[PDB]
Design a protein around this ligand. Structure first.
Ligand SMILES: *[C@@H]1O[C@H](CO)[C@@H](O[C@@H]2O[C@H](CO)[C@@H](O)[C@H](O)[C@H]2NC(C)=O)[C@H](O)[C@H]1NC(C)=O
Ligand SMILES: *[C@@H]1O[C@H](CO)[C@@H](O)[C@H](O)[C@H]1NC(C)=O
Ligand SMILES: *[C@@H]1O[C@H](CO)[C@@H](O)[C@H](O)[C@H]1NC(C)=O
Lengths: 50, 80, 50
């Protein structure tokens, strides 16, 4: 049996399998992606994030 | 009040936001466009052991960078 | 599709072969945790409103 696609891949920096990477890529996280720490919203442009 | 790159049309004075609040103004003496950004604010959390044990208290400023606030630590949840 | 099982009182149907099917099921677990500053949301920058 072959489990190379559900076992973790150490070449990735986050220890996630290929199918988990696909499942993370399909969902657009949209808001609350990474962190909106303060200082980042102190800089402003014409189009502002929700 | 910061300098902004929002090109106002010459008949416009105020530039507004999604929630119908002013976030861009035109200074009358010097015709430039200023961006308004509200001051730093956030929640305060108290991390403590029980008062049956001790009285030492840690304070977490949630979501705030540590430079804009002793044992100061960066947590990705707030300045500790 | 309309189907009729060929039922009979002395006849049976036995499989002679199989297959292995691996299906996908997706279940939500926990949503985004939020918090509301009530005073700043309601009034905002106004000590008299506070
Ligand atoms: C398990 O599956 C993976 C993914 O298909 C295999 O990895 C590669 O498979 C392709 C098949 O087209 C080969 O050309 C590559 O050489 C494989 N890469 C490596 C690093 O081996 C993997 O070989 C499979 N393992 C088994 C035991 O079948
Ligand atoms: C007075 O206002 C005009 C525009 O209204 C401006 O061009 C001028 O520089 C101002 N003079 C000052 C600030 O001394
Ligand atoms: C099923 O049983 C009935 C009544 O016992 C009979 O009339 C019928 O012929 C049987 N079916 C067959 C033998 O396929």
């Amino acid at each position: 049996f072959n489990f190379s696609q559900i076992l973790p891949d150490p070449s990735k920096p986050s220890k996630r399998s290929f199918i988990e990477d696909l499942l993370f890529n399909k969902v657009t996280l949209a808001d609350a992606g990474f962190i909106k720490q303060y200082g980042d919203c102190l800089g402003d442009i014409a189009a502002r994030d929700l | 009040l910061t300098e902004s790159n929002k090109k106002f049309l010459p008949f416009q004075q105020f530039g507004r936001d999604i929630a119908d609040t002013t976030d861009a103004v035109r200074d009358p003496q010097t015709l430039e466009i200023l961006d308004i950004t509200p001051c730093s604010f956030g929640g305060v959390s108290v991390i403590t052991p029980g008062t049956n044990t001790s009285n030492q208290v840690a304070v977490l400023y949630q979501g705030v960078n540590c430079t804009e606030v002793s044992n100061v630590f960066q947590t990705r949840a707030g300045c500790l | 599709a309309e189907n009729s099982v060929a039922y009979s009182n002395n006849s049976i149907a036995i499989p002679t072969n199989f297959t292995i099917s691996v299906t996908t099921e997706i279940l939500p677990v926990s949503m985004t945790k939020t918090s509301v500053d009530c005073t700043m949301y309601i009034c905002g920058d106004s000590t008299e409103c506070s």
